[PDB]
Design a protein around this ligand. Sequence first.
Ligand code: DH2
Ligand code: DQH
Ligand code: AKG
Ligand code: FE
Length: 346
Amino acid sequence: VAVERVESLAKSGIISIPKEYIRPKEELESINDVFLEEKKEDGPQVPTIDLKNIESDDEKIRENCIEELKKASLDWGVMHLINHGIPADLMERVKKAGEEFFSLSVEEKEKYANDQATGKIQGYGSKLANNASGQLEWEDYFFHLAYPEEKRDLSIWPKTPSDYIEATSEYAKCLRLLATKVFKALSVGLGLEPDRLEKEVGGLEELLLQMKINYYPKCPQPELALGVEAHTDVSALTFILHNMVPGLQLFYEGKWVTAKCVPDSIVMHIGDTLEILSNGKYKSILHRGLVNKEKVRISWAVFCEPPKDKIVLKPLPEMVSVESPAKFPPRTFAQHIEHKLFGKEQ
Ligand SMILES: O=C1c2c(O)cc(O)cc2O[C@@H](c2ccc(O)c(O)c2)[C@@H]1O
Ligand SMILES: O=C1c2c(O)cc(O)cc2O[C@H](c2ccc(O)c(O)c2)[C@H]1O
Ligand SMILES: O=C(O)CCC(=O)C(=O)O
Ligand SMILES: [Fe+3]
């Protein structure tokens, strides 16, 4: 087998992209210039949610915050979080370190190469074709478990820069605390006890935080390919950071909306796991990512997942009634992923 990285392809000189990266004719029609889309101020826009008072002593003020978070989650399922409590400089250090790692040569990064054939899913890689179509996406990435600390495999974490492990582990610790706050506000919104949702996804013991760094090289024909294909996140919650280069688009009310860059904010996605548990109340939105020919785009996504086999996911009893039948059958995290993959393959 040959090992092809998109970064190498982007530097091979080619002025035209391989056939494997061109989307189907029907899909190409919806792809435009990400820079112009970013400028449009008409139509629905991704909501910005302020979490300053999410845990305020003032009852009226606290409830107003919880209510705004609830509404955005029921409608969009995605949002720009501000006043989230995570130090701005810590985030700068995480991004700087990621940029230094991907700044190394491909040959150097290959020393961290993953190997799916033997179950080694953590490390440097690029998505391999997994079905008849043979479609490929314009991106490389690095994936690894970031929390709980005792479950980590530090041996595969970048050794360059020297502070990658230190900054990434502290950031992971901060996100874990923020997740607990979001889970409580969301529980209360559904009329459940404060600790209900986080408990159903594994609690402090079983809940996992996976880190995926997405690297999108410049593309010579940006309107024929996608950085990431259209999909919904299978996680409970997803927290993302980026390098102020536009690219994320959301499929809202039948149309692809382009997300704007909001300084010091953190994008949060409601994932399939919470959508299933709430029987469809909280939305797991369809989204994708565009590439361009002028700037390299990078993003840092942290997926909060429940144990893959230990828990059977299904609508909670309180969310199901004769008038509101279950919208999803019972399945584990692993079985859910397999079902989604089985869909496209078929
Ligand atoms: O490789 C993958 C993957 C993985 O290696 C480890 C893990 O813990 C979760 C994962 O999730 C998969 C997935 C599949 C379909 C989706 O719609 C989606 O959002 C995510 C993904 O393919
Ligand atoms: O969307 C994604 C995703 C998600 O939504 C939820 C989740 O819990 C894990 C995830 O991880 C995906 C992934 C991991 C390793 C890979 O090698 C890869 O190609 C893809 C990512 O794509
Ligand atoms: O790069 C982004 O904005 C997000 C990519 C994405 O959807 C994912 O990694 O699941
Ligand atoms: Fe996603």
